Design a protein around this ligand. Structure first.
Ligand SMILES: NC(=O)c1ccc[n+]([C@@H]2O[C@H](COP(=O)([O-])OP(=O)(O)OC[C@H]3O[C@@H](n4cnc5c(N)ncnc54)[C@H](OP(=O)(O)O)[C@@H]3O)[C@@H](O)[C@H]2O)c1
Lengths: 212, 96, 163, 97, 242, 484
């Protein structure tokens, strides 16, 4: 809402400040032309420096949703949303997201009406085995990029208001500032759920004078 | 109810058994190769009867070619179609 | 109602809208000719050839200047006369559409009697009719009156008068 | 099989005119527009279902079904007899099943 | 090298009068007249055409000594489409490539009763229902236009090409196709749902200042423009020693 | 035991959604694909002189090449084929955003905007799809209100008694005067400035009358097909003849079948002078011809450039002007019913002369009133009233090689293939659907019937057999590999 916030100047916050000066101050007509122009830079900073990395990033290589397989996306969801150290889904809503997406994979690649291999999202509490199960029944979904209907569905599961904001930026469009800034304060109390457990990705509120 | 349906110009004739025989053989040949008809299906014996009943010189030659040029080493199905085929040729030469 | 001869700004807008098969508002006034028909080199010189007959004298490089500018450049010499090309189009509009017996005379007399519009405004209603050609053939007298009704309102809205 | 032929004709067995016309077609020469056959069997299995029609409900449908399943089978056999006896055919009877 | 491979690989028959152009086209890839499986017939549904076509195929195959009992399977696509004049053969050619790549030979579902006159032609077969074969190695496509325009094309199964290159070239090829096929599917669905399969070009890949320079350099190639992302001709890659 | 005991008993059902494939050719492992060719073939062929098809498309009565194949091969649509046809015919559109409060992403009825599940598409639309596809009764809405049951003509009648005057303009009235001479009287009405036209006894009028024509059926593009649905703009649709839109769609849909989404990608590999166009038509833009020969006569408002939209070579020009931008060969053939095969010959000889490396080939033709009527007076088309007398429905009227065949079934559309050198296809990594081994045209002989088919093409099997005792070493691929 354009209110000043005193944060510790981590790489993450220093990025935030740099995007305040160059991108989020621009008017609505100039925003999208500036994001498509600076795409490669923005993505390499989100991925290096920020607590919400660029979703579509497979083995360190920057992609887009449209150039990712259904497997690659399912695996990337489990990487960003499932905590290996605690062996649990950081939020039950993020599990619901990953299950909704594995059900969409079944729907797309099945030839006939059938039973879901994911009957309860409770099965995702071991998430590799649930992926290997779905993508062994539908081996075509390992070698095919997302249908354009499935990118639009995925992006509309990210805007779902009755769900904890996703820990990644899925696209660079008009809503980039809302993706970048929303639900920014929880990550400093829960560094297990941040990419490299790196505090320097996170936002820590803290006063200049009381820092002494 | 008593409204006429009949007209001579609507009579459809079907007499081209010379052509359907070759079709009926080739559909069998490939149905056996793809493993749709097995050696326990009665549909194979029904089909053999309907090919024998249309047996002429042209249809015999057509089988001789298709069966003599089957490679029996490509599968158990290609063996099964070569065996049955050779039998169907003898049967079609006998009832010519 | 007071008689006012037709503005060059209206006539021009109609002659351009008409020859692109496009509604009157679809084309904005503050835009060049060479923008609207940027593709086809033939339709450009055909619009310039038609404005050359309608008004008479033509400035230098008229397709690089907005219509708003060029409307005023024509307005000073233009004395509310339909001239050659617009007359020809209004004749064709009445003859190709319209029911039997509905001549331009009877369509003028109906705008006078009903909506009280004189010669100078009649012209302007007919130019608005020409921008909204119904692409059919008005079947009945009533259906045509209704059309001239709907064109009188659309003339009143653009000029700024009341009926 | 070899030598077999199947002529398919639209036909209403409820129509007397259809019955006469169908047999005239079968017996007429190929030049006149016919088949130039001579029936060796007639299997008139045409029928319509009459369901929940007791004595008191006997009406139009049953009077029509009686025409299809009796009266016109007799007219079909008549028409065959009249065609064969016009051609002097006394040695090749049609078998009516 | 190319002129030697052409002399012995591609064009060995052009001079030799004992090899038909139809035999040599198939011989190029080690096929024999017997390996021509399917004849996509012009098959207009006119009395004069459908006989003449069958007669022509039959006399070609009789001459080239196509084995007795190995008829060509007649495909008659116009039972379904009708005759679109100019497009007639393009549709046939599309159906032929779908046949080669699928091994399915579609049947003439309107073949109620094949004309008795056509029985004289032992080297053709008129199927009424679809046959899933084990493979079609070649298809013939014949057209008979008005004005004595007669035309034939032979289309060979593409798997006969890949036996003429190395395993390394084949696997380099397989990897590029696989990549392209994915990008193609991405484009197709996107374009389908956003009614933007067709995108008109606003501009040529060269500016009007470079038009004459690109036309006159045979080695000029487009490259990705870093700012716009669109493929254009750069002034640096025109009469370049590189 | 409550609703909690029988809640986890019931299982979740996955309903299939249409995942439409491009059907690229299935590439076998190298070891499998080396067993079908002879061993000698490796290094024998000059791959710059081997022509391959890398892409094909069509627009026809059954929509695309994908839909047409489904119906040709299997006689019925899959889910994918039914959705594709529904999209083509404009029955369904895609929606992504707010639909009656909820966020919806997926297909909707194009009229009602109500969501449509992919499973429902076949129940909701298949009947309407099959009814409005393929060979069916001519639909007036697709042919400028053309109705073969009511074919407008005009009869010249000498006027026997003077007409009631009508009012015209001065220009129009001088035009009536110039024509009719002293059989019309024009007089100024001073009050208004209009003119009264009076046609006298002996003048010539034309009175409309209708003919019942006996060709009622055709192979039309599916009802609802629109170039807008593929993304062609309104300004192009308004400019070009309809046949041009079939070609434009076919040409992009063919480049997609080749994996070439941006045609400029070609210019990473070839010069701008090495992309050919060899496609052509039998009659060309017959809607434009009808414009310049009939609508112009009737003083109807026709565009001024209508002539340029008639020319057969103009469809290939629009493809170059909107998609390709090449400076390569442009050989537009006119081969009537053999145009497309003539196009493949011209495209092959163009690539084998090194004048091009990629060539768009194919054919297009439209159905209109005039051609339909003239193919009827030639008795080339089936008489549809005779077909009805024989009990034949429209979809059983085109019946090749049948006892009772009686003429062709006119249709419209386009088909395109992209052909290229095999060397270049392997470098670009485009799919290869087929090799074009041969392509040949042939005339026939001294006759007097232009539509009579002849045996000329028989020449492609021409072979000297006086001396055939000993097999020629030239046909042996081992002898040829040895000499290489
Ligand atoms: N005065 C100060 O110094 C100070 C300091 C820190 C924060 N704050 C205030 O505290 C609030 C939160 O701070 P913030 O930086 O987190 O702002 P924010 O990013 O705009 O707020 C978080 C949003 O995320 C959603 N959300 C988060 N977790 C969720 C879950 N588990 N389930 C469902 N929805 C969830 C909520 O949306 P829905 O409402 O759609 O559920 C909520 O509006 C703000 O209003 C801010 O002004 C004030």
């Amino acid at each position: 809402m354009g209110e000043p916030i005193h944060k510790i100047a981590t790489r993450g916050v220093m990025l935030w400040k740099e995007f305040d000066e160059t991108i989020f101050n621009l008017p609505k007509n100039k925003l999208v032309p500036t994001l498509e122009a600076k795409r490669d830079y923005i993505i390499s900073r989100l991925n290096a420096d920020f607590q919400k990395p660029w979703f579509a990033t497979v083995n360190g290589q920057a992609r887009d949703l449209a150039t990712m397989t259904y497997e690659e996306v399912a695996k990337r969801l489990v990487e960003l949303m499932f905590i290996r150290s605690t062996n649990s889904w950081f939020d039950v809503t993020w599990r619901t997201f990953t299950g909704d997406f594995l059900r969409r994979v079944e729907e797309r690649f099945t030839k006939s009406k059938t039973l879901s291999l994911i009957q309860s999202y409770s099965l995702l509490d071991k998430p590799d085995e649930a992926i290997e199960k779905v993508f062994n029944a539908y081996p075509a979904a390992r070698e095919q990029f997302l249908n354009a209907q499935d990118i639009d569905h995925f992006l509309s599961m990210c805007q779902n208001p009755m769900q904890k904001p996703v820990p990644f930026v899925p696209v660079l469009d008009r809503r980039f500032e809302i993706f970048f800034k929303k639900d920014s304060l929880w990550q400093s109390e829960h560094l297990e759920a941040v990419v490299d457990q790196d505090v320097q990705r996170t936002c820590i509120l803290h006063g200049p004078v009381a820092a002494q | 109810g008593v409204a006429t349906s009949f007209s001579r110009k609507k009579a459809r004739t079907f007499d081209s058994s010379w052509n359907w025989a070759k079709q009926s053989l080739l559909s069998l040949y490939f149905e056996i190769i793809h493993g749709v008809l097995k050696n326990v299906d009665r549909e194979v014996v029904s089909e053999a009867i309907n090919i024998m009943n249309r047996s002429n010189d042209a249809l015999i030659k057509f089988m001789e070619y298709h069966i003599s040029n089957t490679d029996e080493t490509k599968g158990e199905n290609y063996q099964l179609v070569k065996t049955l085929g050779e039998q169907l040729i003898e049967n079609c030469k006998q009832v010519l | 109602i007071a008689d006012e001869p037709v503005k060059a700004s209206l006539l021009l807008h109609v002659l351009v809208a008409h020859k692109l098969k496009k509604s009157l508002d679809s084309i904005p006034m503050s835009k060049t000719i060479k923008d609207l028909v940027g593709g086809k080199s033939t339709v450009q010189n055909e619009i310039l050839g038609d404005l050359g007959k309608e008004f008479g004298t033509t400035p230098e490089k008229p397709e690089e200047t907005p219509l708003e500018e060029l409307a005023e450049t024509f307005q000073d010499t233009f004395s509310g006369a339909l001239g050659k090309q617009s007359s020809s189009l209004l004749s064709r509009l009445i003859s190709s559409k319209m029911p039997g017996g509905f001549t331009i005379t009877v369509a003028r007399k109906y705008l006078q009697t009903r909506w009280g519009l004189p010669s100078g405004r009649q012209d302007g209603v007919l130019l608005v009719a020409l921008s909204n050609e119904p692409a059919a053939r008005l079947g009945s007298e009533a259906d045509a009156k209704a059309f001239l009704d709907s064109m009188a309102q659309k003339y009143a809205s653009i000029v700024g008068v009341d009926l | 099989a070899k030598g077999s032929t199947l002529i398919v004709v639209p036909f209403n067995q409820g129509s007397k005119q259809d019955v006469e016309a169908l047999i005239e077609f079968i017996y007429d020469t190929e030049k006149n527009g016919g088949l130039g056959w001579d029936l060796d069997a007639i299997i008139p299995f045409a029928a319509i279902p009459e369901q929940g029609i007791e004595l008191e409900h006997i009406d139009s449908k049953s009077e029509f079904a009686h025409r299809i399943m009796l009266t016109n089978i007799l007219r079909m056999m008549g028409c065959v007899k009249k065609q064969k006896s016009a051609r002097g055919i006394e040695t090749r009877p049609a078998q009516v099943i | 090298l190319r002129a030697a491979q052409q002399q012995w690989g591609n064009d060995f028959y052009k001079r030799d009068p004992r090899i038909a152009p139809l035999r040599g086209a198939l011989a190029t890839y080690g096929l024999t007249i017997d390996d021509l499986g399917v004849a996509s017939f012009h098959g207009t549904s006119t009395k004069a055409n459908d006989k003449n076509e069958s007669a022509t195929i039959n006399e070609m195959m009789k001459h080239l000594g196509r084995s007795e009992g190995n008829p060509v399977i007649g495909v008659f696509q116009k039972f379904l489409t009708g005759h679109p004049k100019g497009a007639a053969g393009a549709w046939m050619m599309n159906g032929a490539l779908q046949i080669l790549n699928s091994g399915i030979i579609p049947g003439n579902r309107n073949a109620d009763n094949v004309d008795k006159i056509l029985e004289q032609f032992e080297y053709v077969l008129y199927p009424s229902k679809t046959l899933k074969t084990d493979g079609v190695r070649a298809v013939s496509i014949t057209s008979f236009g008005f004005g004595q325009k007669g035309g034939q094309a032979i289309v060979v199964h593409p798997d006969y090409l890949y036996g003429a290159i190395t395993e390394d070239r084949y696997n380099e090829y397989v990897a590029k196709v696989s990549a392209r096929e994915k990008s193609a599917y991405k484009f197709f669905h996107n374009g389908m749902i956003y009614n933007k399969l067709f995108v008109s070009k606003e501009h040529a890949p060269y500016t009007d200042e470079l038009e004459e320079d690109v036309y006159l350099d045979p080695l000029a190639r487009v490259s990705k423009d870093k700012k716009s992302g669109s493929l254009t001709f750069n002034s640096k890659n025109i009469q370049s020693k590189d | 035991n409550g609703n909690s005991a029988d809640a986890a008993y019931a299982q979740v059902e996955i309903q299939p959604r249409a995942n439409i494939q491009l059907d690229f050719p299935e590439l076998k492992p190298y070891k499998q694909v080396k067993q079908i060719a002879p061993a000698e073939l490796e290094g024998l062929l000059d791959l710059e002189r081997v022509i391959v098809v890398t892409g094909f498309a069509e627009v026809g009565p059954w929509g695309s090449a994908r839909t047409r194949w489904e119906m040709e091969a299997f006689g019925e649509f899959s889910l994918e084929g039914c959705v594709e046809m529904a999209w083509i015919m404009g029955f369904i559109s895609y929606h992504n955003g707010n639909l009656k409060g909820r966020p919806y992403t997926g297909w909707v009825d194009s009229k009602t905007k109500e969501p449509v599940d992919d499973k429902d598409v076949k129940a909701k639309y298949e009947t309407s799809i099959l009814e409005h596809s393929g060979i069916r009764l001519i639909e007036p809405e697709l042919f400028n209100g053309y109705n073969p049951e009511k074919k407008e003509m005009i009869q010249e009648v000498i006027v026997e008694e003077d007409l009631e005057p009508f009012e015209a303009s001065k220009e129009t009235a001088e035009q009536f005067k110039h024509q009719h001479g002293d059989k019309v009287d024009i007089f100024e009405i001073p009050e208004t400035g209009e003119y009264s036209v009076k046609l006298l006894k002996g003048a010539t009028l034309y009175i409309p009358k209708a003919l019942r024509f006996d060709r009622l059926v055709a192979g039309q593009i599916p009802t609802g097909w629109n170039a807008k649905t593929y993304g062609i703009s309104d300004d192009i649709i308004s400019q070009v003849d309809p046949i041009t839109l079939f070609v434009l769609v076919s040409v992009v849909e063919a480049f997609i079948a080749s994996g070439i989404t941006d045609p400029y990608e070609m210019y990473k590999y070839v010069h701008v002078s090495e992309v050919g166009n060899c496609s052509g038509s039998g009659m060309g833009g017959v809607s434009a011809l009808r414009g310049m020969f009939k609508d112009r006569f009737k003083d109807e408002p026709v565009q001024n450039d209508i002539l340029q939209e008639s020319f057969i070579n103009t469809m290939s020009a629009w493809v170059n002007m909107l998609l390709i931008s090449s400076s390569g060969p442009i050989k537009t053939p006119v081969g009537a019913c053999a145009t497309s095969v003539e196009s493949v010959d011209i495209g092959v000889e163009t690539i084998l002369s090194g004048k091009a490396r990629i060539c768009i080939v194919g054919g297009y033709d439209d159905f209109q009133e005039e051609g339909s009527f003239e193919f009827g007076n030639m008795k080339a088309t089936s008489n549809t009233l005779e077909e009805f007398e024989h009990g034949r429905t429209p979809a059983e009227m085109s019946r090749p090689a049948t006892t009772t065949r009686n003429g062709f079934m006119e249709a419209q559309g386009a088909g395109i293939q992209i052909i290229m050198q095999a060397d270049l296809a392997l470098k670009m990594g485009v799919p290869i659907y087929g090799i074009v081994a041969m392509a040949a045209t042939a005339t026939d002989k001294i006759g007097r019937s232009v539509p009579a088919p002849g045996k000329g093409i028989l020449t492609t099997a021409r072979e000297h057999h006086s001396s055939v005792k000993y097999a020629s070493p030239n046909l042996n691929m081992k002898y040829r590999k040895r000499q290489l």
